[PDB]
């Protein structure tokens, strides 16, 4: 799992009747999952070490 994140939370009182705000976020992420676990193959997983 790998990610590069960013966040800007902003909150502002404009005048005596208005208040605005924003919560901006974003990321670039790379995932990869070991997608043979949970099943029985020959030399795979902890079943393979056993």
């Amino acid at each position: 799992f790998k990610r590069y994140s960013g966040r800007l939370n902003f909150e502002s009182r404009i005048n005596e009747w208005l208040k605005v705000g924003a919560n901006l976020s974003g990321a670039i992420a790379n995932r990869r999952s070991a997608d043979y676990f949970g099943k029985y193959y020959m030399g795979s997983g902890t079943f393979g070490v056993l």
Binding site: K39, Y40, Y41, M42, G43, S44
Partner: peptide, 13 residues
């Protein structure tokens, strides 16, 4: 990869 060894119990919950 490889050959699949059978007789599993199907997981629910």
């Amino acid at each position: 990869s490889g050959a699949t060894t059978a007789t599993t119990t199907t997981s629910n919950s």
